Symmetry: C3
């Protein structure tokens, strides 16, 4: 007796987790948290973004006014969702640069349409087809006007529509390509000639081309769709002698945050900021491996399926007399991260050190706050999956996205390694600081035993040990006793 022991230590847990640092590929820590979101519910939540489920209609079918899409008239969206089951059920058509028209309508986010009174003096309006039935009757695209001859005449059309509004107008129109010369004459009363649609700033001339194409819904003819945007103070001029599928008015074109996504995920009554084709995903984590296609406030796509961020210190087994932190953790330390164990006249005890514990916890929570719940919003982007082979432009779209993903995946990998190294360093540092402060209090009254413990060379009862732990130990009170015990001749 006449001496006491005081050990400094830190906790350890039975169920640690492996993380990666700069120093170590694999190091066990007491706790970690996942930074890559890897699952979705599988449903797209209908809140807080305005979702429009296309059901059997593509956006372009909804635009033109396919009868099955009549329910979509004038609707708006943040996200238009196109289904793989979607199919057209009207006159067969193509759109040169379909992808662009789809994109610009998607981004505009509205199907608002304003009817206008075009002067079609001299032709028959409202042509119909058995290939486009509406309520069991022969019909046509709602937003288009199939003009045909009147009394076997089709006068040369030269029709104007000024934009006297403060906003832009989007006009959608078409050219009919009849399957045969018989159809050409039956419909327009004369041989086919070019169609020219112009403004002060633009001109588009299109040549109708007679001929059979493979029948689609029993139709060998085609309609080719074109568009023209007309600015305030400009004028639409339409010049034709036949084959014109005419506009009935204009679409409003807006700018904002709207987009389109291909998905078969069901739409749920729930609330989630981040939408992917697989369904909505939580956006607490900074990264995700669910889908490169996203809409809203979303984690960034990375290639990794897991990245673990340390949220506690190195986890060190307890060695099997009391002993301190040197190659030794304390599994019995459960009310703190760092603490003291002592042996004195009155027994062997343990107490947590609150200051050091809280300093480590605060710093860890600091970095969690920078990384958790901090995702940023993206809206209309580029397409990232393709159903047809196209070459150059598609090669570029793919390479852009590959490039981006690899750079983010590298950033994620480095960030987590750096953060984890910093966490191991800051938690190791709190242990070292606690030891050093204790060493300083004890002055000449103790010696360092090399194992994270001090040999205190005087009687140091429970109150004395408490004084060291609360930082009120007065070394002068004990120095005489201690020096005599230390520097005695044995």
């Amino acid at each position: 007796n006449s001496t006491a022991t005081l050990c400094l230590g830190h906790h350890a847990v039975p169920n640690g987790t492996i993380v990666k640092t700069i120093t170590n590929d694999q190091i066990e820590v007491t706790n970690a948290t996942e930074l890559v979101q890897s699952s979705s519910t599988g449903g797209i939540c209908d809140s807080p973004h305005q979702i429009l489920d296309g059901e059997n209609c593509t956006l372009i079918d909804a635009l033109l006014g396919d009868p099955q899409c009549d329910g979509f008239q004038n609707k708006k969206w943040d996200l238009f969702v196109e289904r793989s089951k979607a199919y057209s059920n009207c006159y067969p058509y193509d759109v040169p640069d379909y992808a662009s028209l789809r994109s610009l309508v998607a981004s505009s986010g509205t199907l608002e349409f304003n009817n206008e009174s075009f002067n079609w003096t001299g032709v028959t309006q409202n042509g119909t087809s058995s290939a486009c039935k509406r309520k069991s009757n022969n019909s046509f695209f709602s937003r288009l006007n199939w003009l045909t001859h009147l009394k076997f005449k089709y006068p040369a059309l030269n029709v104007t529509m000024p934009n006297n509004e403060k906003f832009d107008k989007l006009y959608i129109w078409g050219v009919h390509h009849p399957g045969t010369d018989n159809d050409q004459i039956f419909l327009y009363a004369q041989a086919s000639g070019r169609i020219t649609v112009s403004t002060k700033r633009s001109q588009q001339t299109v040549i109708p081309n007679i001929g059979s194409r493979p029948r689609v819904r029993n139709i060998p003819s085609r309609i080719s769709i074109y568009w023209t945007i007309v600015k305030p103070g400009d004028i639409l001029l339409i010049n034709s002698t036949g084959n014109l599928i005419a506009p009935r008015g204009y679409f409003k074109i807006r700018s904002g945050k709207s987009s389109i996504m291909r998905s078969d995920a069901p739409i749920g009554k729930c609330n989630s900021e981040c939408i992917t084709p697989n369904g909505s995903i939580p956006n607490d984590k900074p990264f995700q491996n669910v889908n490169r296609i996203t809409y809203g406030a979303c984690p960034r796509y990375v290639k990794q399926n897991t990245l673990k961020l340390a949220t506690g210190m190195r986890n060190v087994p307890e060695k099997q007399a009391i002993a301190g932190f040197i190659e030794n953790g304390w599994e019995g330390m459960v009310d703190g991260w760092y603490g003291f164990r002592h042996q004195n006249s009155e027994g062997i005890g343990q107490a947590a050190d609150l200051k050091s514990t809280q300093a480590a916890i605060n710093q860890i929570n600091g970095k969690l706050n920078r990384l958790i719940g901090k995702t940023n919003e993206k809206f209309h982007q580029i397409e990232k999956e393709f159903s047809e082979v196209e070459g150059r432009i598609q090669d570029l779209e793919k390479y852009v996205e590959d490039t981006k993903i690899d750079l983010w995946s590298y950033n994620a990998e480095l960030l987590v390694a750096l953060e984890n190294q910093h966490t191991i360093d800051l938690t190791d540092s709190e242990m070292n600081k606690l030891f050093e402060r204790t060493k300083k209090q004890l002055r000449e009254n103790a010696e360092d035993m090399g194992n994270g413990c001090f040999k205190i060379y005087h009687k140091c009862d429970n109150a004395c040990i408490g004084s060291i732990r609360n930082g009120t130990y007065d070394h002068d009170v004990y120095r005489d006793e201690a020096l005599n015990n230390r520097f005695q001749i044995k």
Copy 2:
């Protein structure tokens, strides 16, 4: 008496600045410097890049030779500046793929034009229009030759121009689209037919299309502009029966560092390496938030409006007997960053430690030198602002630039946090090293009081203290005295 005190310390300032590190969102340091350039003068400096102010002319108007652009003939530039007020004042035209022709001329950086003698036997040359007045007379684009019938004949043209030069030739030509069939006959004496312009490696066939477009400067006709590059040893062949707006020669096409920028900033007589649409900006800082559009040696565009780099240590208030660096800075320390305070027989004093101060300053200046004045040059890039809706290609251009900016903004954020953490570490380290070296000199003659000070257990006058500070203190001289004082029984 019979003892002295020696404290180690570091400076502190009354007006510190907040920075971000890896450890802390907000930590006050003694000084910092801004790494994001956020202002411009508002003028584009005319030095050291060769600036060409388009004034009322676009590059394309200057190319074709609109009369108001006659002053631009044969000029070169590093940067062509196009003004929002620019307007065309000649025959109305369009350019299929205007953006590409604009880009390739801009990048070439020259309007040098070499006249050639084309053999236009059988037609009238030099047609003019009241829509394109030059010096009050009817005229036309300077670089183009409006051919019309001769004696009411327009023979089929089949005209050749070999490239026997060592460099490439850029040919600009056009097709006239008359407003009516009357104009077609009045000008070319016959019905319109295709124009074919070919080389050994290329062919472009264009169909003139008669019809009224909305009048522009009272003209319902149009000219569509095309271009053809002809290689050394190749040959231009022009084949037409009318409607040909012919070239008068070729433009030199160069390769180099030239570009074009849309800006309304006035041009100043001043010198600045980095140009943005907002005006020139200083390029000392590594980052900038003025404009994503830049030309020359420019900071990189980031989203942040400020990033502060620490250029001094943690700023710690002085606690209100002398005391050392432990939770305590020295506001009275003004001739150094680190130093010594002492109490002895002769009073209380302070002296700066030059070595430690200079070590910290040098390292900080080291990192300033890597980051300040080190910008790199970019020249012709992609467009980043768009006046029309286009869909797919524009979506890709935008996404490429968004992607780039977010990656750089992340790099900037991480770099500054890392550098700041390193600065806090290196400045803390110089303090700790100074304490340790002093501790080592004193040997058994002093004890650490826990507050950044030593209790020296012998009389230590001003010269003795100086000896410790200059590193020449001989502990053996004082050991006997010191040991007696330390290990006395009180």
Copy 3:
């Protein structure tokens, strides 16, 4: 006598290497390794990727079936290598969107072709030209069928080919543009009319255009090449009255990892994973400055020509009595990185410390293992060099690649600086840890002399010194002797 000295130290080498850290632009370390691959052998190794050397043929010439390319029929590749000497030797042709057709065939990786029996009732098949000789006879592209009139009739063709297969079909076809009206009549017996090639999902109409182009291999006519992909359950329909260069069947179109590269490097019998235009390169290093164009498992392209990664500690000259690590390295320490030197009754000695040496070496090898031999594979990408001026799309392709390279170059620069700082820190740390452990063993029996050495205040013979070095020194055995020597009055 009655004392001993024990110094802790670390090795130093006569031939150190300069590296960059976060702290220092230039710091000498004992060893480093290069992370940028800067040379190639200059040959493309024929293993392990399937190489197809185009020799005198482009891919497109091999596709169409130019006679000099007959050897390529039905071949597959991972990498098709196109030579700058390649030239066409058949009928002159162009391909609108040549780059896309080249890319999609390259990416598909196969020239497998399946003949089909088209019903060409009413025309002459197998037209030939003296411009396309095969085995000295007039011939034509192997995969194309030049149809001409039969008995001075050319009936309107309306020919079908269903896809009843489970895979897609790629059809290549053409339109002949005769030099004169005489040739048109001689070949097709009538005036030229449009050609329409259609499916259920697509239509392409092309207008043959009569006229002389500059003679190529004495031919003023041209063939323009087009392609059509036909899906399972779809049907190809060809509709023409002349000028049709017909398909003889279809190409298989596959998806996989194939690509094309322009290179003049000879092909060698050797094995290398990474191919560049300059030749194959080793892929041990994480970065390379040989070529931005790569195929296979390749280091990432960066702008730097060298980045040195530290693989040893700071290299410190030996100062010219034994001395420890403080501003002092040990050039005579050759069997370890860290160790002990001593002076005692029995002489002066040196021994390496294995634990500390191995801890540093292991960590360094750890980071080498993460960076060396870990390259990732890329296959078909975008083009990165261009022989013609094109404007907008090329500007984007270039900017995408510039952007990527600058971001990777920054990542490389930062990574190496960070790693090197960490290596200096971990090697410095092993030295400091060894000193501290020794200090702890010695307890009150030694004093720190400030130069990396302890003065041990008792007789400490070779076995005693060994006990300290193996960590079995019992301080209690010597304490009485040591305390008497330390705290004597001199």
